[PDB]
Amino acid sequence: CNKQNGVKNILITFTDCDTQEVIGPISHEQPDDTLPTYKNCAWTNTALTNGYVQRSASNATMTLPVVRDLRVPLAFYQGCAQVDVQVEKFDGTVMTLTEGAVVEPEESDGRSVTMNIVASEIDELLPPGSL
């Protein structure tokens, strides 16, 4: 059935900045039913008076709750490494993020982590048939 909302594959690649060693792309599993959340548009608007809008540069963010891999140190998930995350949905859409960084790491219990990944841009694949 095409009418299905979910995530099919999650791939994450870690690149330690100190030693330039690349790990991955390993596959990951969701901890619960909360889907990854995106924000593609790289510009943030602000409301002004009578229809005007102040346009300013900002980031493309992404929130990724996943289950940590027992072969990967926990510090790689909390901003000590550069992430290369790529997520595929059940409807065919693919989210590709490269050269990302974790901004505000909350404390985790050692099984489930939530990344606030920031990047210059995020690529949309748009399964066939566009515009």
């Binding site: 594959n9 792309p25 390993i26 596959s27 595929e88 693919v94 490269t98 690529d123 566009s130």
Partner: protein, 408 residues
Amino acid sequence: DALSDGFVRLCIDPSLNFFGEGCKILVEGQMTDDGSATPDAVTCVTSELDIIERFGQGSVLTESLRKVFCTCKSGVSVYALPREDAAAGVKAVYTLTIITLTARNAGTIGNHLSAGSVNPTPNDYATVVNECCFAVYVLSSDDTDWQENLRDWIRSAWDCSKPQCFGHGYVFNKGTLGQVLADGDNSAELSRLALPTTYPVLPYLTNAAYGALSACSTCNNPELNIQGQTFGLLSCINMPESCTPGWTFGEVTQLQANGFVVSGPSTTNYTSPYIYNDVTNYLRDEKNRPNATFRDASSRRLAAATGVALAEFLQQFNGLAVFTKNTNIRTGIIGTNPRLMLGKIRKWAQDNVGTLFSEFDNINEDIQLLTDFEVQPKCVGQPGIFHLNMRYRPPVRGARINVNMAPA
């Protein structure tokens, strides 16, 4: 004496190289018998002090290499291909009435100073330079046979059968309008630098300076066009000022039309000539008469750089995994399916815009990845192999202005 005792070792040598650098350039020219370099052997040259002994005194290759070092202070690692003079080499004979002058190398290369014949035709690129990859090839003579052989080998270097080894060549053609046009070849692997009959400076010197300037300008920036008084100025070359132009304006226009690089004076004391255009010689496609896909010299460098960068980027997929068709990737397995590969390719192409491409028109159409077991007809496909297509678009640069003043 001083601090110099054991630790720290000093040296006051006034002739020293700096680093290996990159962007290798190959220059080919005849050498005199006084030199010690082995004929038909490519070697690296590090400084200008040892050129005079390795390639002789007054030889064409020595002057070309000296001018290359003059133009380029840093950014290239030159390579030289010395050639011994012809066995049946007639020497160039001059006569001055006030002194009898003779060139130091036999052949026609001594007749362009303001007569010898038979130039050595080695045709040995396949063995002397087998797998070395040179960005710029420099030829230091007007012999059409050498230019044809070098063009043929450079074309063979881009052949699709064997792994490509990209490069470009610079040659000169000095003479009258009729002579220079006949030398023109549709191949874009060479850039014919046209020179007038009454050109004072020796042609090979100017050709070597232009090649060195092109290589040192581009190097890691394979988009800059050698053009104008700022980017294409040959500061090493000095020629006396004259009131008679070497080429008429219409003559320049016709030479510009047929893929010829035209030089011009800077003041119209000594003046340094500067290049007008960096166009290659790509008049026609295999049957398409107009084709601008390879007119500019930046096109070849951009194509080579894009190819090398894309090939390097794809190397991560070397035996990683491919879960094509099959199903979704399990948990812990390191792999990817064709959809994710296409997504990553699209991301790489999008991030590379602004330095190698120009925006794009429809990235969902220009980029197209396809598995091989379905690109070919039924039962023709074979497993464990892919396909990819890419209609990239080169950047644009400025041109003529067409100003129109009017008082009132």
